[PDB]
DNA sequence: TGCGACGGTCTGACGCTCTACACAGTGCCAGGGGGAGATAAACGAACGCTGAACGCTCCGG
């Protein structure tokens, strides 16, 4: 489990994230999911900040860092030739 | 070896803009090494103060 999650931290994401930041973001994700299934609603970032004992600015920074890139080759729709990479200057 | 046929492999499948969008279910902490920022001191520099000192026009008894 240790080696698999270490390689998941160091290799799964294209923009590499250090292992401590990976465990921080997935702990935040799992406690957010727990609060969502308990309260039945999306938890406010302030309550997440108090329950994680971190500052709200740290919480929103963590949510910002927890993203996934989108490929430049995703088609828009019916047309195959018009790409997502040709709409950005 | 000749035979069809069986099968995989491979290719494109008129043109443009007006329009045009985004992407989702399973761990956790302690010990240790580096460099970012604050600290108070340091060797050297030039920055000021000291008016003194040279020289001028100067109103002058």
Swiss-Prot record:
Residues 23-89 are annotated as: Sigma-70 factor domain-3. This is RNA polymerase principal sigma factor HrdB. It comes from the Bacteria. Homotrimer (Potential). interacts transiently with the RNA polymerase core complex. Interacts with RNA polymerase-binding protein RbpA via its sigma-2 region (residues 211-347) in a free form. Belongs to the sigma-70 factor family. Sigma factors are initiation factors that promote the attachment of RNA polymerase to specific initiation sites and are then released. This sigma factor is the primary sigma factor during exponential growth. Its activity is stimulated by RbpA.
């Amino acid at each position: 489990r240790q080696a698999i999650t270490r390689a998941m931290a160091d290799q799964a994401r294209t923009i590499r994230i250090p292992v401590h930041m990976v465990e921080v973001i997935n702990k935040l994700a799992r406690v957010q999911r727990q609060m969502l299934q308990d309260l039945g609603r999306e938890p406010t970032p302030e309550e997440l900040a108090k329950e994680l004992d971190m500052t709200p600015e740290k919480v929103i920074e963590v949510q910002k860092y927890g993203r996934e890139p989108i490929s430049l080759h995703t088609p828009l729709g019916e047309d195959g030739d018009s790409e997502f990479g040709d709409l950005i200057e």
